Amino acid sequence: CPTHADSLNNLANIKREQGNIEEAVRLYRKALEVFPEFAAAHSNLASVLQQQGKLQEALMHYKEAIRISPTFADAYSNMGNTLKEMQDVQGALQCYTRAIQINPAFADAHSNLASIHKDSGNIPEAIASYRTALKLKPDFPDAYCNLAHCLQIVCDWTDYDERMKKLVSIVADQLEKNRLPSVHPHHSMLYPLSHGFRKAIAERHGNLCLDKINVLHKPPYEHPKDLKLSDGRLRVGYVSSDFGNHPTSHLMQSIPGMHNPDKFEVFCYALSPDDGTNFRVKVMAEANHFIDLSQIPCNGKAADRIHQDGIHILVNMNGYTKGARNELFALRPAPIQAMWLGYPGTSGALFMDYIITDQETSPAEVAEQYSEKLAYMPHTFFIGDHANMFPHLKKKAVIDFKIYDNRIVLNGIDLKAFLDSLPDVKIVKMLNMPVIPMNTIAEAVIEMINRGQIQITINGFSISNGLATTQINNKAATGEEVPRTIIVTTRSQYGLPEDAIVYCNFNQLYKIDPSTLQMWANILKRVPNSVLWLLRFPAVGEPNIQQYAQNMGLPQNRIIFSPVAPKEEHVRRGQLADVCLDTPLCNGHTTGMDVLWAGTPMVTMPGETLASRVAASQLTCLGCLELIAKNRQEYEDIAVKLGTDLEYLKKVRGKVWKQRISSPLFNTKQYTMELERLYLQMWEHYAAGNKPDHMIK
C-alpha cells in the first residue's frame, strides 16, 4: 500500500525536525525497503546522512533520487548544500541554478544560492537572492538572519531597530521550539541578544558535532592520570586549522617553541594542509611534534591519534570558526580540554572544560556567560608575535618637511646605521626620535613618494616606497620575513591631511553599528579639523557609512577610506594615525595589537561580552588605564582630549611607544611561562581527582 512508504517517510521527517536523527535514518531506510524507487525517501535520507557527516553516502542517495525523478528540485538544492560543505563551490552553484531553473518559486534554493554569493564576496547578489527567498517564503529564519548579516557587512542600517527586534524574536522562537538558531554563534556577539541566548546558540551549534561523532559508536577514552609515561612532562596539544598565513599564527606562532622542554612536550595538530608559508614552517620546526590531521579526515581516527600521543591538555584554537573540527573535542581524547585565543566566546558545549581568559576580559561576575570554567592568565590572555615579526617598527625617524611624529615616517633594521651617514640629523626629546632636515636626501625620498617610484639607493642603503612592498619582497609584505630595507610611510600615500588629527579604525565594517558611528561623529564634531580613517572591508560599505555620517552632520571629506593592505603595511601605516577609536560592539582583537605595536593609543569602552572587552584587557596589560572608558561620555571625552590637547597626546603616544616594549603585552617568553603555570594548575587539579573548577587564582 502506498500509505506505508509515504507514512514512514513523513514520520521520519517529523523525527528529523525533533532532533531524533538516528530514528529518522531508520524510518527512511525502512521506507526504501518498502518502496525502493522512492525518490523523496532517497533525498530525505541523504539530508540526514549529510547532517551526520556521511557526505559521500548522501551524494549517492541524492543522485539516486534525481535518477528516479529528473525534475526533483528539492534533491538538487539539498545536493548543492552537500557539495558546498565539501568545498565544491562550482558543483553547489550548478545544483542551485538547476533547482531554480526547475522551480523559480523555490525559496530554499534562492536562499542557498544567496549563501554562495555571500561567501564569495558578492554581497549585492546575496542580498538580492535572500530577498527573493523572503518574498517567496516570508517566514524564513535562515534567509532573514543571513540577510541581516549581509546588511551588517555593508553597514546598511535601514530599519536597523526593527531588524534587531525580529532577529531576537526569531532566536527566541527557535530556542523555545528546540531548534538550531539561524544566528551563527560567532555572529551573536553583534546583536542585542541576552547572554543566555548567546550561550544557548553556542550549545546548539556544538550539539551538531555530537550528531557527527555518535555515528562512530566510539567508547570513552582512558585518560592518563600521571606524568610517568611522559617522563614527568605535561603533554599539551594545540589543535588549529590556522598554522599558516592566518591571524592566529601571527599571534602565537612563537609559543610552541618557547615552552620549557624540561616540563612540557608540545604537540601541534594541524587541521589544514601546509600552505607553504614561513608561519607553517616555524611551528612545524619548533614544536616537539607536529601532526597533520588534514591527512586524517575521519574524526574517529584523528581523535585516536591524539589519544595515542597521550595528551594531557588539548587546546581548541578554532571554536566556531572556519576550519574547525570540534568533533575531535566532542570525542574527549584528552582529560582536560580548553578554549584558547582563536574564538572570542564560549563553546556552550559540555566537552570543553576551560576557557583561557583573564579577569579584565571575563570578570568573575559574568561567568554565567560561559559554559566553561574560567582559567585566568595573570595579565591578558591575548598575545602577539609583533616583537618577532615586525622588529623594524621598534624604532622610527621622520623628515621635517616644514615637527610631527606621524606625517612622514621611516622604519628599518639598518635605520640607525643609515642615520650615522647623515651628518645633520636632529635628535628630538619626547627613547627619542631622529629628525631628518629638509636636505638633499630628504628631497629625494619625498620625490620617490610623489613620483610613485618603488625604491631608491642612498649611501648604499635601499629606501623603499611603503606602498610597493609586494613588488620588493612578498615574504616581507606578509610578515613571513622581516623587511630588509628602510621603508617610507607618509600620510600623502593614504590621502590623509598633513595638518589635522587622524582617528583610525581598521576593523571589519560589520563591527560598526549606528551607535558607534554616532559616537565617532560626536568626537569629530568636537575636534574641528579631525578626520576618520576607515577600512574598505568591503568597499561597497563605503557609501553607506558616508551617507549615515553626512546624515549625522559630517561632510563627506571627514571620512577617509583605504583598501586592505598586506599585513606588514597594515601594521606599519598605523603609525600615521594620532589615535585609534576601538569598536565597542566588538573590539579589534588582532587589530588592537597591531595599532598598539605601532605606538598609536587606542580608546576603548569595554562592554559585557568577551569580544567587547578584549581591547581593555590589552590596554590594562600595556598599562594605559586612562584609555579605557566607563561609558560613552568618557569614551568621547578621552578621544577629544587626545585630539585637542596636543601635549597630552604627545605624552600618551610616548607612553604606548615605550610600554609596548616594557609591558608584558608583546612578551611571548613571559606569556608562555605564565601559560605553563596555568596548565599545571589545571593538571594538578585533575590529578587530585577534581572536576574542572574556576582557575582564577
Binding site: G80, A109, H186
Partner: peptide
C-alpha cells in the same frame, strides 16, 4: 566561515 544552508524536507503525497 561558511554560511549555513537550508535543507528541504520533501513530504510524500
Amino acid at each position: 566561515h561558511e554560511t549555513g544552508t537550508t535543507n528541504t524536507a520533501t513530504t510524500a503525497t
